[model samples]
Target: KPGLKKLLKWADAKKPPETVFTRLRLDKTGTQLFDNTDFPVWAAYTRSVAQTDSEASAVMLKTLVSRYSDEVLSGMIAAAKKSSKTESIATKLETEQMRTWLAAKKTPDDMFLVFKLNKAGDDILSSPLLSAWTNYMKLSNKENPKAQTTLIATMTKHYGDSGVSQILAAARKSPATQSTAKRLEAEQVQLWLKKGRTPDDTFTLLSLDRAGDDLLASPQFNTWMKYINYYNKENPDEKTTVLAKLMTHFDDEELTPILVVARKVPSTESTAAKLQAEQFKNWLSADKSPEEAFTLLQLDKAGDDLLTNPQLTNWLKYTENFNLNKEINEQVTAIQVFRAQYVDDSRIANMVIAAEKVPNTQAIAKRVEDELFKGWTVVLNKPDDVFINLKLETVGENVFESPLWSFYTKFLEKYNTANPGKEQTMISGLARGYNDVTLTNMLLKAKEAPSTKTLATKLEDELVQYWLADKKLPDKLFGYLELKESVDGILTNPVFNVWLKYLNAFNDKAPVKKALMIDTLKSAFGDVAVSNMLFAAKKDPGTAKVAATLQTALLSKWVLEKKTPGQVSAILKEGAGADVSAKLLATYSAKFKVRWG
Candidate 1:
């Protein structure tokens, strides 16, 4: 009566009587008597029934199995497979129910899951279901070989190929299915290869044992090599041994081209180098002279490695006495190769000495000399005594052409800091030995020591004299001179007019410098004095045009400076002629009106 009451309550909520089923056992009489019409309630009650009555459990399972459409069974099978526990009750029901369901559904799709789920050694494999499923798969293999390949892979994964050889042989023997099956097998072999299978074993597995050469020549093998090459490149710390195996398998002639291409890749260059070096050593051991080794390794075509190869030095020595034609002459060797090979300091000095013996070798000798001395030809650690003792100043022109000039200047600066008075002597040495305009400028800019003061003055005087004679200012003159002093001296000197004549003569050729000179004149002599000077100079035919231009600029500067007409008139009255003074006043009055009217 309690069980019937609980069942009535559960039926009110549309749920099975789970509590009553677990609490009370139903005998065969009750099982027959109960209303078992609801399938969801009955299916839900099956789990509880299985734990209590095995006969009733089987009956309920059979009832559920009878109710399964193909879709329902497929869904239940997939869901049961994803359960966490292997011994789950849902899995047991799904596994037991599929047999009767498959008996009804018998399609190849239905059998696919049976083969996939029931691996070898499972009782399901030994059942009549397995024989029927294999028969279904074989039939499907003819129409859809991909499906068969999937089945084969699963079977091989579970029980090795030997266990599934019957189905495999069937698929292979069919002419239409053979190529697809073989391709699938080849892909599996490649997968095995990636998992560290030996090539011999891989080929044997793929039935390519007698086709070893063909396997090596396959596009798949080339892809494998490229994959490993890129892998080795990206993972420099963990290099693969596949490249070494490839080197051993391929002959030198075949690998040389590969090595060449590999060397072009930034990541593979080091590996390529080592392989090339090994090949070179091997060639040498096999009765090849150094020259022949170089040729065989194609070291001649190597850019930077030609110098790095130890064998190159020996090759050079070997060919020293031979009269090579111009095409292969060592004398006219490429500068980069020669420098990279013979760039040592002592070697470069020897090359320089030898180059002096021939005209053709001079250019290379100089380049080698530059390469050797480019770092530190003038050691900064040494004192001025070292420079003087070495007579480095004698080669001051050449040394300046090298990068050591910067170091030399730094050395001089430090020496001047330490020794104080010796800076002028060094500057004078550079001035006298180089006699270069830059050196003179350097002298001009040196610190004002009594020893260098006269030297700077003399250099400045010489530059001014040069400008006067040529009517052309040296480019470095303004950059070198003390601006205020130079301007003051030029303006107040007795030969100031002569300097002005030179300025007027070179005005067109050096407009920027002429503008600089005029601005300097304005700074040295105030606006009014400079304006009067320009007005007076207008009388001289040579100075008229430039002086007028200067005066125009000065007046514009005065107007911008907000100099009133009275300020300009007062300054002009002192030095300008009566007519010039009156004309200047009228011009200022007009400008003042226009600017501040």
Candidate 2:
């Protein structure tokens, strides 16, 4: 006892840190923990015996087995056999322990130890444990035909053929079992068939094979095709080959109604088989007229391939056939529509092929344009001089409005280089919609910086005149151009001063507009504009004042909303100091109304 306590203490000390292990030694006394009194402990001992690292339990079991050999060990075994109470206790213990183990761990390989224990095999032969094991195996590995076969064979000597019969019956209904074992069982059934089994037995084997997923994935597919072909050859009077072939091809959902009529098919020797085959072939072929195919089938409407095939009756037993019918009809219609479209316009066939094979359809479109529309007149009977006179109509809220506009922008960048005379036409086409970036990109893509400067000056003139007149700019105006090289030309252009003057017209009511214009200028001009503001004083200080005033006014509004300017100024004095911020304000206020107000 002293030794046992010391050992238990040591195990408890070395136990895992998890809370579940806290109850390990405390729940059972030294005797009950290791003894055969409770099956829970006994089950634990079995696992402990099997586990390589169960040193503590092993030491305890060895000591208990030695100290109380006949009294504890053999006596309990006898008691377990004689008393239903002990049997129930062991069963409960095993069931609970297996459940826990399965929950905590993966499915174990050892059928005996993991699941049935003494409830399986020869261990149960001498006891009612066989029946218990059978029932449990059916409940546990019931879906597993191989395991079920092994279970039945273990009792073959006593139950004989009747036992095998019962197992086969159980397996027929075990749908949830995995397909690997089911397939083997199916092969086993085939073996039984070769042994000249009764018709009923042969049918049972076929049913089992058909029911399993393995059969669906098996080489049996081709085998069945051969079987139907051979059967039709021998029974020439019954032309079943067409229907039989159709069965393999069509899903059961499509064949349920057709199956009702298929059995009426006479042998190939009969005229019925030949007629049916022709009708079925026509119905399935896309080249066949739909009306004629329906007439040959002797139906008002043509059913899909499934309805034309005879072997697919079982599909109706499982799937939602009505819903599947709708989908099947939809797919058939869609295919017909696609084929008709392809037939009518061969160009679509080429387009589909190109779309599938080509990574970028736009590149393909461009190539197609170059091949088909090269030197195509941009305008009919228009003089070349009129190209410069052409102005693009702008469209949409911005450049990103539509894919057509996006494609147009990309097209100009791509094609304007080799065709410089067409540059004006291309720019005109793209300028139908204008925004900042579009303008910038156009300028950058120009052949020479002077050309870019000319384009930017013209665009600036249009923008300023429209702004000064307060006329609503056309939606289709050219998008903004991101011409980095053209930025100097654009900002320094005399037209830009007019643009600034037009921007200053908004005064205080147009801080947002002023800010947006300034941002555009900054983006277009970069440090050139910044240097002009600071040192050169060559650029518009009014624009700078607008940006600075907005920055300070917006920041002050955020921190001191609804406060008087004086109160806000006081708060700024304490928080940020008046000297620095006042100077900042002075610089800004100088151009407040002049720039943004």
Candidate 3:
């Protein structure tokens, strides 16, 4: 009675009583009962039969009884008449469920049933419902060969190689019923490959033998190559073996990408790197097109890494083992071509080594020397251009190995000869870390042009800043400026305009150093430089401190050293004019004492 009461109460609710009905159905066990489709009416009519609450409940029950009274009475009569029949209550309940679903208004809720019935459709196979439908199809023994074909086709067509294997496994379990399914799976895989959509996992599966020969036959050969490369990247141990298998089928077109990919493989072990190197050499020595091989080597990012391989090193050594005009000559000719045209460091090194291996090595060496000399000249003429061209491929390890001193010295000599009086050019190059003994010697020999001496001193100041800052100074550079002779010549020079420019530049950045530098200038230029400072301040009348300091220092020096102002002022005013001298006197007034220490 409690179970029936719960069922009736659940059924009378406005919405469907799914959970209550499920529990009722479970409790029914094997009892013969009316189906739940009729429970809505039964629940409404049986209020007094169970527990009627009020007038409203009585009226609702009467209304339900009136509406379905005839159908319920007829079914009841039929159930009573067939009480002795063998049909179980479970079967009857399932029949009622099917009837209710069929009678419901068609909407998205009905789509599941529609999809279940249309498994043979391509749209159904392609839909997300395919997995569910396939599971249902497996459960149901209904002979829908069309559905079987569509399911297999859908699985293989959209999914990659792994999908093909999955479909195959599914079909294998029911080969008798899924023969058509098996064939359809294979055909769909072929179609996928033919369409040229080789996903990365497709290669992974193919390399693992989960997918078959279909991968190799695709018109997009590069797709398989990409897979090979992917395999090599993810699985290094298999690289050489996989590449060897691919090599049997590879030609000029495919060889490049494979070798390039092989070189790029993370050869963390020295042995693996050597193996990769040997493979490259083998490709080079093989009967393949030499031009194409070289071109491939050039195009690869690993071009440089390939040159260091021991096998290639050995190949270079044995270049003489082959004929002078045939094997040896051809390789040498290719290397020469490579050297002249190839800008990649890897390819350049290979060409250079191969050229070195040629018989009559001196001739080849001369050719290289000539080429290098030309290259160096280009760099000398445009050092800025050389700096601009600094790339990983051109600089390589040679940046560390080449002697900076010799290159700097030779370049400075050549540059000085060409540019002559342009000391600023040499200064710029030297400041940028290209300095040498030749540049310093040439600067010393040039005889003091006011600007030249000024630039040399400025460069020397920069060199000392870099050194005190613990930055790298190019060797043998501006070292002559440290010598007393060069310093004296700059101090004693008749022209002081260049020294003014240097002091101005220095004072703007380093005031303390600038103050100290004034003392150095006074000691070097002596009275001439001191008087010029006064003369400059006098003309402008704006540099009163400078004028006062210079006049006092000169007068003191003249007193101490027994020199004459006629000698000093005459020398100073030779560069300064009468207006400057008058302005100096006016600005300083009468008091002139040494204030600069």
Candidate 4:
């Protein structure tokens, strides 16, 4: 007891070297220290000192085994089973000592402790502990397949099949164990299959060359086939020969639906061709007509090649038997199809020539030709001069009013605004096709800009030709030309002077022409010139007698509207000199005979 107290005091004061601890003796009375009640203290002390003095601490554990062998061993076995710190103490015992204790303890609990103590693969496989548990479980519950499965699972977890094979072989001896064991094996196979593992690899894992036909017929087989199909599709060049294998096992009828599914997907043309050829022969052997083959294989959507095949003329003839007029009505129109097919083709001249030759197709061809020109108008996106290349001017003036014309003009405006350096050909096209006042006026307005200056001059000449041929002015021609702003420029042009004379003779009282003449004279030469013209009409013998009548009519119209000297002064001052205002005032005063303040 004193020795034990001295040893504990030495341990508490400062952990002594393991050699010193091992050399120190506890008498026979100290043997009581190895009691189960003291096991925790001993275990903690052994672990604490073992880090600094493993050899001495190992000797100390062996000494305890010698004195209180049964009690220490029992405690170690309990701790080992419980996974407590003392379990490690059992490992510190000499191998022969542990073996002796293990032999003496023959129960399942003792065997479990031994197994827990040595987990190495060789040690575990050759373990008496495993054999004890196996025999006990088999004898205890022969029908408890759950017990057998649990034991197998536990063994397999530790050493894989290395240790589990023995248990599995033993389980196979029992009919009931065989059933549960096979079920477990199937579960493992399903797990492998779910991971996209091949059947051959999985069967090899199970040590079986082939699965039962019933197993292959299950949903698992279908799932595997789907997996293989997806794999083949993803790896096109390296596609698996899985279908060939399936064909050997599955009949044509059984595999037909799978092949059909593979056929409809794009980029699988090779596989689809093979499937289609097989289906075609099958249908023929079954006495199905070409029409039946077409319907069954959905050949209508086989594209232009199949539709134009001369060999399918029988099937094509059958199409006429059906009420295709409704189908044609429901589908895109022939003209629309023609436009889609040939809209991008540049040889549109051929289309127009063909239209003129075929009486039945002339209208269709004309519609297609018009659409082609309109589309080219957008694609070319060139100035109006580009249309000359296509001879669009021959379509006549009505084309100018078309929506295509509107789109082209608008597209041109936006394109020109974005790209400012280009010469504007849009206005040129309008002038060439449409010589009317509206578009001519647009060209004249566009001509104000330096970009359209050249195009506008040509359009102006074209306008003069049209007006001269008519021998009359369009009612809004001057307004369209914005002649009010260009009055001086127009008065200087000799050609315009001829047009003005014709306008004067046509309708002297025509409101637009009269106002235009009045505004033009005011804008070009001021109120002073206007008044002088009136005076010249009355006095100058060289003035035409009809011009005097025209001047008088305009002056009377101005006076009836209550023209004042102040109004005439302001009008002349706008774009005229200060001398012109006073001259105009004098003219107004004399003409009206009205007083001024």
Candidate 5:
């Protein structure tokens, strides 16, 4: 009647009474069940077999879980969590657990009993601790691990190294236990990882270290390296980098296969950062192109972080070491090499930050900066890169004294001097960082080079405004470009008109100095300069009006100074310009004609 009641419930849900179907010994009655693929249905179905007729159920559960892919078994384990503990499939699915078997023999002080009990021995070998761990759960968060990480880590910690060896040797003989065997084999390595032991002495615990050629070819050492990788992943902040201390353990001969596998990880471009110098060197020595080498290196982030400044410089420089030329004195720098291969700007800028730390390699750093900024106008999308790229301020409070400013100035001087026809404007370079003395110096330097000479004079007028702001002329400004005030010099002086205009503009504020400057001009170059202009007016119609007009203005100015028309005529006649001089006197006398005339 109870069996009927369980069967009726299965009929009502339209599902098999999975638990009671196996519990009632239905299979022993020569009754076979229908098949199902879903985990909960089948797991409860098969778990009932283990609970009711356990020996047969062990075979059923094993074969059933084995028939299902890891996906289905994983599904069953996950679903088991939702099932009540009394009805949990994990509790019912009791296969031989390693720790259970381990403890069974362990508690009796009979380690050999485990090896001697053939059924328990077979169970440990075949059942896989995965099943034991699931059953042990409701007991551990009962615990952790998405898988064997904890299972193996615990048992190995219990028995230590040799116990792991014994357990592993037993499991490896079966093909069904390959993945399980692989994990069991690595418990010690994970233990070492958790212990923070260096990977260098890893195999020494297993007595496999001394065998050189033998050790490299061994599978255990491979797992040691593998979990060492896992170790780094686990302790993300730790610096037990792949190559940090492990480089000494194996030469390129051994590190080759190891690094080759790591470098070949799914994303070659993203994965090799933890790689070392030998890794990139190997790529270069073989068939990889420079760009290929660079892409795999992926240094745009902050350089590879593996190499220090000098080390990175050496790495970058090493590519061209074979091309070193003694006769041409080629010192193939890193920037030179990368630019030859057309490295992109961002990487170059990043290289500037990473590569500049060494004192001498700054040439590379500076050269790298020039190359980036040269093309960045169109190539870079960042607005700040064009205007505010990370660098010393282009305009400083006193740029004249900064070493960078001084350096560019000296370079412009030497370079423009060497190629006079193709002179670069030093003022254009230096004009950006402005100070009174520096701007004045730029105008002075800029005046010598034919390229900026006209601009220098143009720029001088802008600076002269500042000089006149004090209403007192700087002797330095008015004298330098004012030209030599002599019979020959003043007649040809281009800046005299500018000086006159300035003197006129400030006459009210500093009339005494203006009058003094005017008198000084008259005493030095007055007669000769006027004669030259009057002769030009008679010789060329183009000069006639401006010359006559200027002459009239001078006479009128003298009239304003209380000189009579006849005295102005005498001074003008002394300049050897009698005709136009009388003409200018008449023009001034007529304009001032006493309003009463």
Candidate 6:
């Protein structure tokens, strides 16, 4: 009670000194016998004098205004209005600076921070009550070492939720009070752990990240998991658990790290299991893809549980039906989902299909190939790039499972058989994604199945060329001069020259095909590589045979398209320098003469 009384002393009103209280001095800024001191008492005395000695109260207020010289916020307005409810000064500009000054106060942390009757603390406080509130918190914390518990209990008892909410908020934001706030927030969370706390208990909540650091490893987190476990064990079937609660309520980005930490420790393995299942279900139900779900759950790198998880299966059951009628947003299929999982198996990736032991997933993808990717039109991510579903389906994206190739081979074989009368489309055309793997299973899909060994040869050639010119793929990925180096080796390579001669000799090759062939050669084997070889052949002796072979392929391919001598020379000159290209073109002049002459 004494403490209460001590804190409320600012409320004790004082009488103004009557001797010079009414006297006005004759200075430029007139001095009054009344001085502003013991602010709460002076400010408190204001309305009382206005009631009893109305003229004198006005004099005191006017004197304060003069002392402040137009900077003073009004206390006199209360005298005019009969009482200050804060609304009167607040609605007006000049008289309201006191309230603004009051608003600047921090919920103080220093228990020994001096409090006295002075203008600084006085003018800044909107009410004597707030001044008491700040001082009480500082001193009360000083009195009690367990300030969070004591202050929270006392505050709720005296001031109610409103003040408690404010102080808690202040404690949360202030560096000094941050631990105190977290302690209090721990209790707020504990309120839920009393049964199984979700956000509904704390009408006011700090973000869990703000509540503490290392939230995943915190005491609150263990309590949270136990609470959720007990709660879900008790509750009827519906959405349940901490991760689900976070996404739905008091949700933070606790998702990535919060989820993974569970998988690390044995204690939280249950919740991590719980979150991986439940969090994945929610994300899969929403916008998250099977590919991203793989990374988020860490399943792609670990082992295959994606197909094994029944919750995800059930999720797909409902949503896949919903998604089937609408292709614009297709639900992830069994293959794509399987592709998402086990797709990061570095083990399977590095395995020799014949030499290494097969895992359960390779067996699964091999078995389920026909059932998984039914009735789908896959598309490529880049121009002539091997993978589709650009995000995770590419070589660079690490589509690591070799059995992924088997699934496509079998799936595309099914597609061509179903359309047996129709031109059996390539797996690249039908399935829409690839690992750029060249296995017999993939090659056989083209070879054994194609009625036209034509498509087989084309597929076989592209795959082998893709393998032979594997150097070209590096340019599309990353490099500076390294790209030129790869393309240089590829242009001079013997296998590529054989393919070059084959393309050049194709009698039925259409004009559009010739133009496309030239464009493909220029892009895949850079015009600069060819031009440099042309220069090197002219500059040196030993290199001329390989350079001559390449130039002949280009000149013959261009002449098949009826490119004039001028066009051939310009094409040669772009990468070659005009004078040098003219010399390179001279040996092929008679063939270009066939087109122009």
Where does candidate 1 have its weakest 10-residue lDDT segment? Answer: 27-36
The CA lDDT at 536 in model 1 is: 67
lDDT of 4 by residue, 18-126 (tens): 4343443343335343334445454455665555445545556565555554534544444454455544554444333444443453443344444462354433433
**Segments of candidate 4 deviating more than 4 angstroms:** 1-324, 341-479, 492-554, 564-597
Per-candidate count of clashing residue pairs (backbone under 3 Å): 0, 41, 1, 1, 1, 4
Candidate 5 similarity to native, TM-score = 0.33
Runs of candidate 1 exceeding 4 Å displacement: 1-40, 44-87, 97-198, 201-249, 266-298, 301-597
Tens digits of per-residue lDDT for model 3, 52-90 = 334323333233233343234223423533444323332
Report the CA-based lDDT of candidate 4 relative to the real structure: 0.48
Model 6 clashing residue pairs (backbone) = 74-95, 102-124, 192-197, 378-432
lDDT of 4 at 431: 55
- Which candidate wins on lDDT? 1
Query: What tens-digit string does per-residue lDDT give for candidate 6 at 1-597?
Result: 123343234235433433123322223323221233333343344544445444434445454554543222322332323334433422232223332333433223321122221222212223323333343455444545564323344444444443444455555665755776668645543444464544433322323454443555444455455546655665657546566566654343446556566556777666566666666556645756545544554445444334333233334443354456557745565446554444333222223232224464464333333223342445321211222322224442223323444434444565555554542334343224543333323444444444535655666555443433333332232122123235544544443443444344442343333323434546655655655655566455656676666566777776777766676676676766667667767856787776666
User: lDDT by residue for model 2 over 1-597, one digit each (tens)?
Assistant: 223344344444543322222233423443343333443443343344344424433443343344443223333433454566566443443344334334443233333333333333222333333333444455555445444444433433343333333443444454543343345344444444345443333333334245342322233333343344544554577545544444454543344334334335433123333424444454444343433332333332322222223322222111122223445433222223223433322232234334435464544334433322222232221222222112123322332332233334444454555456634343344333444344434443441455346655565444444443444221211112223335433444433444445445534344434434534444545523432333222224544555455344444332333434454344344423356547644544444434432
Tell me the tens digit of each residue's lDDT in model 5 across 36-56.
223344445444433454543
Off by over 4 Å in 2: 1-205, 208-213, 235-238, 241-597
Model 2 C-alpha lDDT versus the unseen true structure: 0.38
Model 1 earns a TM-score of 0.28
The pairs that clash in candidate 1 are: none
* Angstrom error at residue 107, model 3: 18
The residue pairs in collision within model 3 are: 538-584
List the global CA lDDT of all models. Answer: 0.49, 0.38, 0.42, 0.48, 0.48, 0.44
**Model 4's TM-score against the true structure:** 0.24
